[PDB]
Amino acid sequence: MYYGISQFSEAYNKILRNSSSHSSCQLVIFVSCLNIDALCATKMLSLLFKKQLVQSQIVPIFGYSELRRHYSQLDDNINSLLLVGFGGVIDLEAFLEIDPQEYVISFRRDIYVLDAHRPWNLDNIFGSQIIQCFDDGTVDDTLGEQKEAYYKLLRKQRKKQIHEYEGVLEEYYSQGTTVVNSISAQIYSLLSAIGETNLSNLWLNILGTTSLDIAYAQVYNRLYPLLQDEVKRLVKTPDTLTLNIQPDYYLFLLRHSSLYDSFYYSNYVNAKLSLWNENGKKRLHKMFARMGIPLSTAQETWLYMDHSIKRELGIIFDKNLDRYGLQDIIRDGFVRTLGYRGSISASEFVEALTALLEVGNSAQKLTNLRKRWVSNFWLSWDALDDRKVELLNRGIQLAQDLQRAIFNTGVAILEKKLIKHLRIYRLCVLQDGPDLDLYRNPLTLLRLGNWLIECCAESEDKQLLPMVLASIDENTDTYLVAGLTPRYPRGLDTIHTKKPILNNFSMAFQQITAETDAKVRIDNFESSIIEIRREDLSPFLEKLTLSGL
Amino acid sequence: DSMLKTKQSYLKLNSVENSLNGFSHLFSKPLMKRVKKLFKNQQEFILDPQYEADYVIPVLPGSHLNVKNPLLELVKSLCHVMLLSKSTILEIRTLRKELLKIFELREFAKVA
């Protein structure tokens, strides 16, 4: 590894040696927009660097083109640069044409890449001293064999060694893009090693680690015990700030919407009981009756809903949910209370943040979209502090609205049966329908796809196939396409969890674009999302069908 | 040739005129099969670089339409030339709808 976890603080010291000045902004940070873990890590870093009065600047970017342009905008006065949430799996030197001899003086301007994606560039690690990263603990063990060939390859019978090295490099490559650790986890580990831990840092660490529950439950289960132990290690006066381990359930805004709507919109219950047709609603009403809560009572706000059954809810769930088999809905989570203001939980808060990111407030229109994305990111950032709650109530209500719209579109999709089952991968295209303008956002599209893949998994089908989903915006006449991996049922044992399902869509897309002259634009930091032309879609799809996946 | 043949047959027999009515029954199925084959080949080889020469839409003085798929204009012209009958409208319209069903389009669409 370059920087092991046992030396992070040293790198911190280096920053103080180079950037701590009086009247010179000598540190700029690039953040992977449209990501929650990056935002949490950036907030932690901003607080830390405000503590020691180190002047700094935060810059949000959306695509690699903006990265290149803003790097070209940089000046040599910047001794240290930060990149968080991206830039791990590509060689920046070949990307930003860094001349090692231009910067040697040492190499002057240091750049700190901090990301999590595991198929990250080997040359970008072992070949450059200008570029330097924070390994999570992957190189020391996993890459114990790949680095040997690179070191060797950086009288007619020696071609066997070259062939072996080439084969080793090829075997290392051609793997899916995955995430195995959280950025905020490493940031909090550095904070703990230094000695600057407090309740705000713990809250931000919890947010960062819990933003991955949707997609990386394995990572979440690996990381939970450390959070539990740390929160254990660390009269209701109006200044109480309590962090608790309270039971919580996989429910959409349980503490801000009625229990009926919570069950109705919860994705897990949807998948388990098929609430998009009539039998699902009948089974839901049967469940409510057998629990014994009136249908008029269960449709009241959580504040005013009856205190006795609020107390008895746990026992009611324990005694009733077994018949329908929904007992995997009960888990243990974190709750934050601030005096007399109320109560909130991590899941609700991250859903509010995600919705606020989604909704807030040819080339020209694309630039306008990419700039309003940054504006929404900054609004979400400002929403973090405890002095503002009117930027959180709005987020909660917008989350409700967005989930309703997603459910309304998904029921139509599953009713029309647009999901075409090919030989290898499923496909569905939203040619026409309602509210299509919302799905121009990659995160909204991912939310829709997550619900769809959950629904598909929660069936009797025994085939795990990648899914391809497309949209349309008539203004640009382009299709936005995202590739989605299959997911195991949540209530599954860990023995069949040797390796997470990888994602080869980025490799397939890049190979097809290299071999044919399609009119695509691959600039998202998420390499599994591309933009394509309406007339160019179908042959492209054919190619993807005929290519090796 | 088909129109000549049907007019000759009608004359041999002896706003509608049976001189031409029923002439499209001669070449329907081969035309449909050929259109399907053309569509498949165009789908297969449209994005190839070395085959990009033969799909280039020529530019001429007075040209103002900007359109993408060549087979669409081929079939559109081949149908508009038949539609001039003014007496066999319905048969031509059925054939045109059947042709458009090969693509994922609709009978009264703007692009058609």
XYZ file of C-alpha atoms in Angstrom:
661
model
C 0.000 0.000 0.000
C 1.121 3.584 -0.271
C -0.380 4.992 2.963
C -1.420 2.317 5.419
C -4.027 3.156 8.036
C -1.198 3.071 10.600
C 0.368 6.186 9.014
C -2.570 8.412 7.970
C -1.757 11.032 10.609
C 1.716 11.483 9.115
C 0.119 12.527 5.830
C -2.065 14.923 7.814
C 1.100 16.454 9.247
C 2.471 16.867 5.726
C -0.511 19.066 4.876
C 0.256 21.292 7.853
C 3.858 21.454 6.662
C 2.832 22.636 3.192
C -0.592 24.314 3.244
C -0.833 25.977 6.671
C -0.215 29.622 5.768
C -1.446 33.118 6.601
C -2.666 34.851 3.426
C -2.676 32.129 0.775
C -5.396 29.576 0.015
C -3.119 26.552 -0.397
C -5.636 23.685 -0.303
C -8.530 22.902 -2.656
C -10.892 19.927 -2.374
C -12.811 18.218 -5.179
C -15.884 16.275 -4.063
C -17.788 13.580 -5.938
C -21.167 15.266 -6.294
C -24.366 13.209 -6.051
C -22.928 10.954 -3.343
C -23.638 10.878 0.383
C -20.428 9.360 1.760
C -18.379 12.004 -0.045
C -20.540 14.738 1.484
C -20.108 13.305 4.987
C -16.335 13.027 4.602
C -16.176 16.569 3.225
C -18.135 17.909 6.196
C -15.804 16.127 8.621
C -12.742 17.503 6.833
C -14.190 21.020 6.733
C -14.794 20.967 10.487
C -11.308 19.607 11.172
C -9.611 22.219 8.995
C -11.734 24.984 10.491
C -10.456 23.908 13.913
C -6.787 24.637 13.152
C -7.664 27.696 11.014
C -6.333 26.293 7.736
C -7.771 28.281 4.842
C -9.478 26.129 2.230
C -11.973 25.973 -0.623
C -14.599 23.370 -1.552
C -15.283 22.647 -5.229
C -18.092 20.357 -6.467
C -17.697 18.635 -9.830
C -19.930 16.293 -11.806
C -17.962 14.764 -14.688
C -14.420 14.012 -15.777
C -14.573 16.909 -18.242
C -15.122 19.370 -15.396
C -12.265 17.713 -13.510
C -9.922 18.250 -16.462
C -11.048 21.840 -17.018
C -10.720 22.869 -13.376
C -7.342 21.154 -13.045
C -6.230 23.165 -16.066
C -7.534 26.204 -14.181
C -5.252 25.463 -11.211
C -2.125 27.445 -10.346
C 1.205 26.238 -8.965
C 0.572 28.147 -5.717
C -1.601 25.215 -4.590
C 0.747 22.924 -2.670
C -1.860 20.256 -1.884
C -4.992 19.093 -3.687
C -7.757 16.786 -2.454
C -9.967 14.466 -4.494
C -12.691 12.503 -2.699
C -15.214 10.041 -4.085
C -13.691 9.313 -7.504
C -10.473 9.059 -9.467
C -9.362 5.710 -8.093
C -9.714 3.356 -11.051
C -8.005 5.509 -13.711
C -4.459 6.806 -14.124
C -4.527 10.543 -13.463
C -1.088 11.072 -15.017
C -2.294 9.794 -18.376
C -5.496 11.719 -17.626
C -4.047 15.111 -16.637
C -0.654 14.768 -18.420
C 1.452 15.345 -15.321
C 5.158 15.603 -16.100
C 7.131 14.221 -13.121
C 10.173 16.282 -14.127
C 8.066 19.449 -14.352
C 7.080 19.220 -10.681
C 10.275 17.822 -9.129
C 11.991 20.435 -6.983
C 9.758 16.375 -3.701
C 7.549 16.774 -6.790
C 6.025 19.984 -5.357
C 2.224 19.921 -5.660
C 0.855 16.842 -3.913
C -2.494 15.317 -4.877
C -4.438 13.112 -2.445
C -6.920 10.734 -4.071
C -9.396 9.202 -1.612
C -11.912 6.713 -2.995
C -13.253 3.227 -2.322
C -13.658 1.402 -5.648
C -11.596 -1.810 -5.535
C -10.704 -2.447 -9.200
C -8.497 0.621 -8.994
C -5.545 1.323 -11.241
C -2.362 -0.582 -10.418
C -0.060 1.727 -12.389
C -1.618 4.755 -10.684
C -0.311 3.259 -7.427
C 3.036 1.650 -8.130
C 4.311 3.929 -10.890
C 3.839 7.436 -9.508
C 5.133 9.207 -6.421
C 3.265 12.408 -7.316
C -0.105 10.649 -6.897
C -0.729 9.089 -3.501
C -3.788 7.559 -1.852
C -5.196 6.007 1.330
C -5.380 2.238 0.972
C -8.129 0.671 3.063
C -5.964 -2.389 3.712
C -6.292 -3.992 0.282
C -2.791 -3.837 -1.210
C -1.019 -5.475 1.735
C -2.996 -8.714 1.340
C -4.959 -8.930 -1.920
C -2.371 -7.418 -4.273
C 0.458 -9.550 -2.863
C 0.860 -11.186 -6.287
C -0.137 -8.566 -8.869
C 2.631 -6.119 -7.933
C 5.407 -8.642 -8.626
C 4.712 -8.784 -12.361
C 4.453 -4.998 -12.588
C 7.781 -4.574 -10.797
C 9.421 -7.127 -13.090
C 8.000 -5.685 -16.320
C 8.241 -1.954 -15.554
C 18.035 -15.138 -24.206
C 15.177 -16.424 -26.366
C 13.555 -18.440 -23.544
C 12.730 -15.458 -21.302
C 9.469 -14.770 -23.170
C 7.736 -17.124 -20.724
C 8.175 -14.542 -17.958
C 6.704 -11.802 -20.162
C 3.761 -14.038 -21.069
C 3.158 -14.856 -17.397
C 3.278 -11.173 -16.436
C 0.835 -10.255 -19.207
C -1.505 -13.044 -18.135
C -1.341 -11.932 -14.506
C -2.166 -8.346 -15.470
C -5.068 -9.488 -17.652
C -6.414 -11.714 -14.871
C -6.224 -8.819 -12.422
C -8.148 -6.683 -14.902
C -11.530 -7.639 -16.408
C -13.374 -7.476 -13.088
C -16.410 -5.576 -11.904
C -16.470 -2.212 -10.162
C -17.360 -2.614 -6.479
C -17.096 -0.754 -3.171
C -15.880 -2.495 -0.010
C -15.398 0.359 2.476
C -16.756 3.792 3.346
C -14.758 7.008 3.058
C -16.182 8.410 6.288
C -15.087 5.251 8.110
C -11.442 5.920 7.244
C -11.843 9.611 8.050
C -13.252 8.736 11.473
C -10.434 6.239 12.032
C -7.954 9.058 11.420
C -9.963 11.299 13.754
C -9.895 8.628 16.470
C -6.144 8.167 16.062
C -5.669 11.924 16.443
C -8.073 12.504 19.334
C -10.736 14.842 17.919
C -13.835 12.653 18.229
C -17.154 14.128 19.329
C -20.890 13.777 18.778
C -20.984 15.648 15.462
C -18.188 13.472 14.079
C -19.943 10.320 15.278
C -23.216 11.450 13.691
C -21.514 12.139 10.365
C -19.737 8.771 10.510
C -23.067 7.056 11.160
C -24.659 8.860 8.206
C -21.802 7.907 5.904
C -21.874 4.261 6.934
C -25.671 3.985 6.749
C -25.992 5.556 3.303
C -24.847 2.170 1.896
C -27.602 0.015 3.415
C -29.538 -0.064 0.134
C -26.829 -1.600 -2.044
C -23.906 -2.862 0.091
C -25.546 -4.635 3.015
C -22.417 -6.789 3.324
C -20.302 -3.684 3.951
C -22.949 -2.359 6.332
C -22.950 -5.593 8.345
C -19.153 -5.620 8.433
C -19.033 -2.018 9.676
C -21.930 -1.955 12.169
C -20.151 -3.381 15.276
C -17.510 -0.640 15.281
C -20.207 2.050 15.223
C -22.125 0.303 18.003
C -19.043 0.022 20.216
C -18.027 3.628 19.549
C -21.468 5.021 20.396
C -21.428 2.897 23.555
C -18.021 4.335 24.462
C -19.264 7.893 23.940
C -33.903 14.947 33.415
C -34.537 16.382 29.935
C -32.933 19.804 29.988
C -33.454 21.858 26.795
C -29.828 21.195 25.795
C -29.825 17.384 25.853
C -28.361 15.644 22.805
C -28.949 11.902 23.126
C -27.722 9.152 20.808
C -29.454 5.824 21.351
C -29.602 2.275 20.030
C -33.344 1.986 19.506
C -35.142 -0.694 17.478
C -36.081 0.450 13.988
C -37.742 -1.081 10.954
C -37.353 -1.040 7.181
C -40.124 1.533 6.869
C -40.398 4.630 4.689
C -40.448 7.596 7.100
C -42.001 5.727 10.009
C -41.679 8.648 12.433
C -43.113 11.216 10.013
C -45.860 9.391 8.083
C -48.801 7.257 9.136
C -48.075 3.586 9.767
C -50.447 2.531 6.981
C -48.626 4.609 4.367
C -45.324 3.394 5.806
C -46.210 -0.254 5.203
C -47.760 0.629 1.846
C -44.673 2.392 0.474
C -41.979 0.260 2.130
C -40.027 -1.418 -0.654
C -39.338 -4.639 1.253
C -43.001 -5.221 2.110
C -43.911 -4.309 -1.468
C -41.541 -6.958 -2.801
C -42.667 -9.562 -0.277
C -46.424 -9.179 -0.748
C -47.022 -7.755 -4.263
C -48.909 -4.619 -3.265
C -49.183 -3.434 -6.879
C -52.291 -5.609 -7.393
C -55.406 -6.258 -5.327
C -54.339 -9.393 -3.448
C -51.488 -7.450 -1.872
C -53.875 -4.875 -0.436
C -56.186 -7.639 0.770
C -53.321 -9.363 2.584
C -52.236 -6.015 4.048
C -55.722 -5.377 5.414
C -55.805 -8.906 6.823
C -52.473 -8.239 8.537
C -53.756 -4.985 10.020
C -56.957 -6.617 11.270
C -55.098 -9.549 12.826
C -52.793 -7.071 14.542
C -55.920 -5.328 15.811
C -55.158 -1.719 14.885
C -58.239 0.017 13.429
C -57.991 1.243 9.858
C -59.023 4.699 11.058
C -56.398 4.631 13.818
C -53.551 3.407 11.605
C -54.172 6.336 9.223
C -53.193 8.993 11.780
C -49.939 10.877 12.225
C -47.343 9.188 14.420
C -47.398 12.030 16.953
C -51.128 11.863 17.666
C -51.482 8.097 17.217
C -52.443 6.276 20.395
C -49.806 6.135 23.129
C -50.709 2.678 24.443
C -50.351 1.022 21.054
C -47.234 3.108 20.394
C -45.796 1.414 23.474
C -47.123 -2.026 22.492
C -46.065 -1.828 18.825
C -42.991 -3.988 19.386
C -44.929 -6.839 20.978
C -47.664 -6.522 18.347
C -45.134 -6.872 15.531
C -43.365 -9.755 17.270
C -46.603 -11.691 17.695
C -48.119 -10.961 14.266
C -45.427 -10.671 11.569
C -44.405 -14.338 11.757
C -47.340 -15.630 9.696
C -46.546 -13.355 6.755
C -42.821 -13.930 7.241
C -41.874 -10.249 7.416
C -39.814 -10.644 10.601
C -36.708 -9.504 8.712
C -38.127 -5.969 8.914
C -36.955 -5.503 12.518
C -33.423 -4.197 13.068
C -31.437 -2.045 15.504
C -30.585 1.534 14.594
C -29.555 4.966 15.862
C -31.788 7.797 17.075
C -30.735 11.391 17.756
C -32.735 13.650 20.071
C -32.138 17.374 20.625
C -33.941 18.680 23.695
C -37.606 19.367 22.974
C -37.286 19.562 19.184
C -38.268 15.952 18.493
C -36.724 12.678 17.358
C -35.043 11.552 14.137
C -33.322 8.423 12.850
C -30.479 7.763 10.443
C -32.604 6.158 7.723
C -35.120 9.004 7.701
C -32.368 11.608 7.671
C -30.486 10.029 4.764
C -33.707 9.607 2.769
C -34.450 13.291 3.331
C -30.932 14.162 2.167
C -31.270 11.984 -0.939
C -34.604 13.549 -1.869
C -33.222 17.039 -1.321
C -30.369 16.155 -3.672
C -32.866 14.881 -6.256
C -35.205 17.883 -6.210
C -34.613 21.453 -5.122
C -35.007 25.130 -5.955
C -28.271 20.745 -26.400
C -24.945 21.567 -24.773
C -26.447 24.610 -23.048
C -29.285 22.546 -21.563
C -26.857 19.845 -20.435
C -24.683 22.484 -18.760
C -27.753 23.983 -17.076
C -28.709 20.568 -15.699
C -25.173 19.904 -14.477
C -25.059 23.292 -12.737
C -28.437 22.922 -11.031
C -27.145 19.590 -9.732
C -24.272 21.422 -8.016
C -26.683 24.035 -6.662
C -28.842 21.287 -5.156
C -25.725 19.679 -3.678
C -24.790 22.905 -1.922
C -28.346 23.319 -0.638
C -28.176 19.807 0.819
C -24.810 20.664 2.379
C -26.263 23.747 4.067
C -29.132 21.580 5.309
C -26.730 19.598 7.535
C -26.346 22.058 10.410
C -28.620 21.951 13.451
C -29.589 25.621 13.091
C -31.816 24.799 10.087
C -34.815 22.455 10.113
C -36.944 24.138 7.469
C -34.477 22.645 4.982
C -35.212 19.208 6.469
C -39.009 19.292 6.682
C -39.039 20.209 2.993
C -36.692 17.307 2.302
C -38.969 14.881 4.136
C -42.089 15.982 2.265
C -40.231 15.837 -1.051
C -39.059 12.312 -0.208
C -42.685 11.335 0.324
C -43.643 12.837 -3.044
C -40.750 11.211 -4.915
C -41.471 7.777 -3.459
C -45.122 8.151 -4.452
C -44.150 9.048 -8.022
C -41.691 6.149 -8.250
C -44.337 3.712 -7.011
C -46.885 5.105 -9.473
C -44.511 4.560 -12.388
C -43.361 1.120 -11.224
C -46.899 -0.216 -10.936
C -47.520 0.892 -14.527
C -44.314 -0.795 -15.696
C -45.162 -4.098 -14.029
C -48.753 -3.873 -15.281
C -47.749 -3.323 -18.913
C -45.100 -6.084 -18.656
C -42.478 -4.055 -20.523
C -39.717 -6.171 -18.940
C -38.384 -8.196 -21.878
C -36.523 -11.388 -20.940
C -33.629 -11.919 -23.343
C -31.198 -14.845 -23.206
C -28.614 -13.118 -20.979
C -29.907 -9.866 -19.473
C -33.333 -8.383 -18.851
C -34.280 -5.142 -20.583
C -36.969 -2.499 -20.159
C -37.376 0.910 -21.797
C -39.629 3.776 -20.696
C -40.686 4.905 -24.153
C -43.724 6.898 -23.013
C -45.559 7.598 -19.782
C -46.048 10.214 -17.079
C -43.524 12.336 -15.159
C -40.588 11.399 -17.396
C -38.835 14.716 -16.736
C -38.000 13.600 -13.186
C -35.893 10.644 -14.343
C -33.190 12.794 -15.922
C -31.423 12.440 -12.548
C -29.141 9.394 -12.255
C -29.886 9.002 -8.540
C -33.646 8.993 -9.141
C -33.162 6.445 -11.911
C -31.053 4.309 -9.561
C -33.776 4.490 -6.906
C -36.348 3.284 -9.429
C -34.030 0.515 -10.574
C -33.343 -0.544 -6.998
C -37.052 -0.975 -6.388
C -37.415 -2.885 -9.665
C -34.531 -5.247 -8.907
C -35.911 -5.846 -5.412
C -39.280 -6.750 -6.927
C -37.672 -9.048 -9.502
C -35.527 -10.767 -6.870
C -38.547 -11.316 -4.600
C -40.105 -13.820 -6.998
C -39.905 -17.520 -7.833
C -37.379 -16.898 -10.626
C -34.024 -18.590 -10.005
C -31.993 -16.599 -12.551
C -29.723 -13.701 -11.564
C -29.459 -11.555 -14.678
C -28.134 -8.009 -15.118
C -30.771 -5.396 -15.869
C -30.577 -2.546 -18.381
C -32.893 0.435 -17.973
C -33.370 3.400 -20.294
C -35.288 6.676 -20.357
C -35.992 9.569 -22.744
C -35.895 13.369 -22.683
C -37.539 14.734 -25.827
C -35.669 18.044 -25.499
C -32.327 16.370 -26.262
C -33.637 13.254 -28.072
C -31.244 11.039 -26.115
C -31.606 7.884 -24.041
C -30.078 7.731 -20.566
C -29.054 4.135 -19.865
C -27.930 2.608 -16.567
C -26.810 -0.953 -15.861
C -27.906 -2.696 -12.672
C -26.557 -5.802 -10.985
C -28.705 -8.533 -9.417
C -29.181 -8.687 -5.660
C -29.721 -11.618 -3.337
C -32.728 -11.665 -0.996
C -31.963 -9.642 2.115
C -32.881 -12.485 4.454
C -30.100 -14.771 3.233
C -27.271 -16.470 5.090
C -23.669 -15.291 4.828
C -22.278 -18.591 3.502
C -23.541 -17.710 0.012
C -21.833 -14.318 0.246
C -18.280 -15.238 -0.747
C -18.069 -12.404 -3.271
C -20.475 -9.581 -4.138
C -21.956 -9.549 -7.619
C -19.684 -7.486 -9.854
C -20.582 -4.987 -12.589
C -19.142 -5.481 -16.085
C -21.343 -2.883 -17.792
C -18.659 -0.185 -17.723
C -16.173 -2.488 -19.453
C -18.752 -3.566 -22.028
C -19.701 0.049 -22.755
C -16.098 1.179 -23.147
C -15.261 -1.776 -25.403
C -18.240 -1.161 -27.688
C -17.462 2.561 -27.851
C -13.844 1.769 -28.705
C -14.751 -0.686 -31.461
C -17.599 1.303 -33.067
C -18.243 5.004 -33.640
C -21.451 5.476 -31.687
C -22.651 8.918 -30.594
C -22.317 8.342 -26.865
C -20.963 10.537 -24.058
C -19.359 8.611 -21.183
C -18.494 11.273 -18.604
C -20.244 10.185 -15.394
C -18.012 9.323 -12.451
C -20.211 6.241 -12.202
C -18.902 4.384 -15.247
C -22.033 2.209 -15.504
C -24.182 5.151 -16.679
C -23.925 6.475 -20.239
C -25.909 8.658 -22.622
C -26.855 7.415 -26.090
C -28.796 8.644 -29.107
C -32.321 7.545 -29.969
C -31.436 6.335 -33.463
C -28.227 4.731 -32.161
C -29.737 2.797 -29.240
C -31.091 -0.321 -30.930
C -28.041 -1.412 -32.982
C -25.889 -0.635 -29.953
C -28.087 -2.935 -27.899
C -27.702 -5.613 -30.558
C -23.948 -5.285 -30.239
C -24.171 -5.605 -26.466
C -26.206 -8.760 -26.982
C -23.628 -10.257 -29.326
C -20.593 -9.249 -27.263
C -19.024 -11.345 -24.534
C -20.147 -10.157 -21.113
C -45.209 -4.267 -64.643
C -47.945 -5.360 -62.229
C -50.192 -2.427 -63.137
C -49.699 -3.130 -66.839
C -50.541 -6.801 -66.283
C -53.749 -6.087 -64.375
C -54.918 -3.516 -66.924
C -54.306 -6.019 -69.721
C -56.193 -8.747 -67.847
C -59.152 -6.444 -67.196
C -59.249 -5.415 -70.857
C -59.183 -9.099 -71.798
C -62.154 -9.733 -69.500
C -64.373 -7.317 -71.443
C -65.081 6.397 -58.901
C -63.607 2.894 -58.892
C -62.053 1.244 -61.941
C -61.367 -2.488 -62.052
C -58.605 -1.795 -64.584
C -56.142 -1.393 -61.707
C -57.957 -2.693 -58.609
C -56.262 -5.722 -57.097
C -52.819 -5.026 -58.555
C -50.953 -5.004 -55.233
C -51.823 -8.661 -54.565
C -49.064 -9.685 -56.985
C -46.025 -8.369 -55.095
C -47.065 -8.073 -51.436
C -45.234 -10.949 -49.732
C -41.896 -10.601 -51.603
C -41.927 -6.877 -50.856
C -42.528 -7.504 -47.156
C -39.775 -10.118 -46.948
C -37.336 -7.826 -48.761
C -38.181 -4.938 -46.427
C -37.557 -7.174 -43.413
C -34.188 -8.258 -44.821
C -33.197 -4.653 -45.541
C -34.156 -3.622 -42.011
C -32.117 -6.440 -40.474
C -29.023 -5.628 -42.531
C -29.287 -1.898 -41.818
C -29.605 -2.617 -38.100
C -26.544 -4.860 -38.271
C -24.155 -2.658 -40.263
C -25.166 0.950 -39.562
C -22.459 1.643 -36.955
C -19.574 0.036 -38.846
C -16.933 2.564 -39.964
C -15.966 0.881 -43.234
C -19.650 0.539 -44.174
C -20.393 4.183 -43.330
C -19.899 5.228 -46.966
C -23.037 3.708 -48.484
C -25.368 5.092 -45.784
C -24.329 8.720 -46.359
C -27.360 10.844 -47.229
C -26.431 12.981 -50.258
C -26.810 16.757 -50.140
C -28.300 18.627 -53.102
C -29.400 22.219 -53.715
C -32.878 22.849 -52.377
C -32.676 20.092 -49.756
C -34.138 21.168 -46.413
C -35.295 18.013 -44.597
C -33.066 16.674 -41.812
C -33.834 13.005 -41.155
C -31.944 9.989 -39.860
C -33.080 6.521 -40.966
C -32.748 5.946 -44.740
C -35.042 2.915 -44.943
C -37.853 5.104 -43.609
C -37.608 7.482 -46.565
C -37.230 4.553 -48.950
C -40.503 3.008 -47.791
C -42.191 6.416 -47.497
C -41.433 7.242 -51.132
C -42.302 3.716 -52.274
C -45.697 4.090 -50.582
C -46.391 7.668 -51.681
C -45.788 6.663 -55.297
C -48.468 3.979 -54.948
C -50.888 6.238 -53.050
C -51.401 8.427 -56.147
C -54.064 5.952 -57.330
C -57.024 8.015 -56.032
C -59.132 4.886 -56.613
C -57.386 2.075 -54.680
C -56.742 4.033 -51.488
C -57.773 1.397 -48.948
C -55.520 -1.379 -50.256
C -52.539 0.990 -50.339
C -53.296 2.131 -46.788
C -53.458 -1.458 -45.536
C -50.131 -2.217 -47.210
C -48.586 0.938 -45.735
C -49.785 0.096 -42.226
C -48.421 -3.433 -42.589
C -45.073 -2.029 -43.741
C -44.965 0.434 -40.841
C -45.676 -2.417 -38.422
C -42.212 -3.770 -39.279
C -40.864 -0.678 -37.562
C -42.146 0.286 -34.122
C -44.223 3.161 -35.481
C -47.899 4.025 -35.895
C -50.181 4.671 -38.840
C -50.704 8.436 -38.459
C -47.378 9.369 -36.853
C -45.644 12.579 -37.907
C -42.392 10.819 -38.821
C -44.360 8.545 -41.187
